[PDB]
């Protein structure tokens, strides 16, 4: 009884693009000793990451300064080894080599090679994350990255009506255990990595990221199971999509040639002053989209996008109460 | 200093196209006070009063006229027509039992439906069906009531209300041809426009000439503002207000969009189209041809100084309302940082 009186959520998407970061932006809105040793492991993985593939671009990468190279050797050193103690020696061999021009340089061409997304948000930060008594904020938990394997149910009450929202693995090992979540799914909420066209992913280190997006999206708009179903569709990281079209240094056009032809939508709403440029490029990938979602359904589902910012708790506040609604007469829609 | 600080929105829209319904709503949500309550059902009872009139004095006026259901309901017609003018009207119980079974009569229902060859209230059908509750002396009205509740706007009416700590200085105009002379006194450091449009009127002229479109002086209206030098740099949020009453219209297909706006018969639903879930596709391409009829105006100029903010409303729905202002806030905020 109380089964079919629930809103449920079901959260899908490639890795890395945005899932969990969604939920905890609802845990922060509706509902610390483990979770500093993930935000000390994400900073010791951002900075092996950029050392280690210094010398492994084409053309490789030198240090700005010849004298950093021990720092380098250090880092190395330390890398895969178990529980790491993390010495005083560590942060500063790390802060060295972060205001180094050659690791920053390295760090530019990042889309070469497989960096998390908070790499630079933490490096900014090495000097209060090493602190004793260093507490994490709201957004160090939203930037924390913990790749998720298994299936996470995370239910909240809001305006008296209760939603059960699950969060999945994003990548492909993950996918098979996604048909466990299909039954009495009120609407699926598809994340989607924006920034990420100039990016591969982490499986076989071949297949283009958006692309990959576009095609897990076109299995799921045809899925057998899901035909009843309408998804809403979060063009994520708006942020990073927005920085790197005004770094003007990888271009679009590159990965997906389409883009030279394409023109800014007659109703396209750009935010106040937002470059002409940054308009053009997110109603890009949302069009991208789009052509999927009106090829097949016949009227029996719709897909409702949104352009989004997941690590922003007052832009997913905003979003969300604006779907409470349709999530609703969805719901009605399936009685 | 507080000037500067505050968020100062102003309601822009033709006559009876729902600003003032917009403001109730933003009362209702965030000030105090239930309800003069003895003011307001006067206004209510006037409103009734009205509708009633106008509907029966149009019967033999139509071409071609329309005739009673039952003829026996003519003593009935004879009263209301014979009490059309009178200034202190008691409303005595004779009053709500003729307009109570002129309702009910088949033929002034027909003439109702063609409430488009002539100048009806869109409160109508809501105050006619609830006679029975209106006439009680214990009547009070629920907040729909005052809702639906339609009064002529003269003049310029500021409301003030906070959410979240934030505080909105809202103006009132009057819409009407005789009151957008002035429309210049709250033009200072506005922060953003709000413009009402009655989507549902595609098939009715305004009450100042009975020739114009009411649409089609909307959409004028728009290119006025939106081009006026005064305003260069102010944002308009478009609300496409009076959907329910859309839907229905076209539902029905007794009156067609095409015959008051021919384009309509190659226009398509753009790609990017988020209907309602089980919506009817006939809807989605109608409010969309309304939707974008506003917006071949928005960019055909500005040069981006000021852009345009398109929602679907309707105003007498606490719930749509509460929830597309909300929607609305951190554009708002953005427009006045743009501002600094
Ligand atoms: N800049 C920025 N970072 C974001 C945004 N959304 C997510 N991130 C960051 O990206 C990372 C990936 O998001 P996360 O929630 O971990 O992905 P996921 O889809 O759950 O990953 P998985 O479980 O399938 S492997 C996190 O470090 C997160 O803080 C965004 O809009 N902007
Ligand atoms: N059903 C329905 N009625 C609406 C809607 N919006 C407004 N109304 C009704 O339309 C009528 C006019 O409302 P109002 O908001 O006063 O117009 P106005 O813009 O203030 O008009 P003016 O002051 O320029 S003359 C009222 O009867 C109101 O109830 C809507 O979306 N649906
Ligand atoms: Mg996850
Ligand atoms: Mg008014």
């Known amino acids: 009884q109380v089964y079919r009186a629930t809103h449920r959520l079901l ?12 939920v905890k932006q609802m845990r922060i809105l509706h509902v610390k000793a483990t979770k500093v040793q993930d935000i000390k492991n994400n900073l010791k993985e951002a900075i092996e990451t950029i050392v280690a593939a210094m010398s492994n671009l084409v053309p490789p990468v030198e240090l700005a300064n010849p004298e950093n190279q021990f720092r380098v050797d250090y880092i190395l050193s330390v890398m895969n080894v178990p529980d790491f103690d993390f010495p005083p020696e560590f942060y500063e061999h790390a802060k060295a080599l972060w205001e180094d021009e050659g690791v ?32 994490p904020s709201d957004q160090d938990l939203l930037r924390c990255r913990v790749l998720t394997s298994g299936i996470f149910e995370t239910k909240f009450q809001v305006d008296k009506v209760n939603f059960h929202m699950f969060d999945v693995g994003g990548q492909r090992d993950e996918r098979r255990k996604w048909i466990q979540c299909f039954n009495d799914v009120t609407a699926i909420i598809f994340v989607v990595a924006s920034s990420s066209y100039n990016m591969v992913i982490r499986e076989d280190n071949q297949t283009n990221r958006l692309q990959e997006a576009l095609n897990l999206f076109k299995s799921i708009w045809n899925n057998r199971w899901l035909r009843t179903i309408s998804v809403i569709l979060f063009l994520n990281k708006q942020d990073l999509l927005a920085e790197k079209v005004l770094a003007g240094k990888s271009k679009i056009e590159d990965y997906f040639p389409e883009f030279a032809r394409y023109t800014t939508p007659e109703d396209a709403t750009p935010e106040p002053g937002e470059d002409p440029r940054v308009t053009r490029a997110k109603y890009f990938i949302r069009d991208e989209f789009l052509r999927i979602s009106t090829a097949s359904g016949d009227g029996r589902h719709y897909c409702y996008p949104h352009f989004t910012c997941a690590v922003d708790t007052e832009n997913i506040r905003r979003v969300f109460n604006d779907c409470r609604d349709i999530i609703q007469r969805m719901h009605l829609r399936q009685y």
């Open 11 to 22: 959260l899908l998407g490639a890795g890395e693009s945005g899932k969990s970061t969604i």
């Open 104 to 135: 920053r340089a390295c760090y530019e061409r990042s889309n070469e090679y497989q960096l998390i997304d908070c790499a630079q948000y933490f490096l900014d930060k090495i000097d209060v994350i090493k602190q004793d008594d260093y507490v």
